[PDB]
Amino acid sequence: ATRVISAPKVTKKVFFKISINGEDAGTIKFGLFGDDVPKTAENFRALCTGEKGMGKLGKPLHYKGSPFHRVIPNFMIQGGDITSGNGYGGESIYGSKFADESFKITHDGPGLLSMANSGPNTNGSQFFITTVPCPWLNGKHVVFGKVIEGMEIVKKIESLGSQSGTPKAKIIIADCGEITEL
Template sequence: MNRRTLLGAAAAVAASPALAVVAASPVLAQQQPALDPENTLILELPGGRVTIQLLPDLAPRHVERVKVLARRGFYDNTPFHRVIEGFMAQGGDPTGTGTRGSDLPDLPAEFTPPSRARFIRGTVGAARTQNPNSANSQFFIMFAPAPSLDGQYTIWGRVVSGMDAVDKIKRGAPGSGTVTNPDRIRTARIAADNR
């Protein structure tokens, strides 16, 4: 499996003045009266709890994969191996190399038109190789808007609380984002499982 990176997109984002503008998104900007526990992922990070609303209406296969892996305990103790200041934090590879995924097959892309959802602060997307149909277990959480990713990567969730904990994730080396002694996900669980 090839290294799963977003470095090319990071360079485009770094050069983009759009970082200062938070784009409105019909799906991601909606206020939800209550979260569906079956479609809520809870990450316990060193900096605190992060609650992610899963979006099966945008990416049903990816949401199902995240739920299966969280219920297996796959994400527990996995590192945020690539973290780029002003861009994103990437995790979901148990080896911490950015080259591995789960034992399940890769997923076909579920790209969302930018008119429905955009990569803004708090968006959670599926990491992949150059092959659009290579997403597996790795994901990334946006620190800032990245319009260059819209329609190019699958969006499967959005942070609804705990962005302060995401902001505390240890940053990687300038350019590559590779993190030495990275922060790890302590636990990842589906809210419905703790009733």
């Protein structure tokens, strides 16, 4: 026992490489709460690596190339639309939208990964990262990870958003994958 954590255990690590209008913006690192929400964390991890290949909607189950389509200053940045890329698409690794796995982990602070949805049990590939505490989202959105490195880049992406959410630059997951070197 090494740390005395006030927070869920990080059981898997993954990353995004961010491009803004074609230019590199750096890397964001995430750790996922695999012991708490293992089905949601596995979905996000396989979408990072792309290992499941082609989804039923005719585009890769891979976050690579997907944009951040809604960036709302002092709220959150939202991406993960891997089918149509317009903010209405997406697809999980489970051949269908899957159910809310747990609501125990709450949106207490900036930096948390959580799933976007359109109702109960409609999780897909779309996710969002908090930049403020969002306790009104508790019970509606499954939290399943957190930024562990590169929050400065999250903030950079934030600073490009609007009150409407339409961002002021094309913000792209240039590359992504699982951190496998320890």
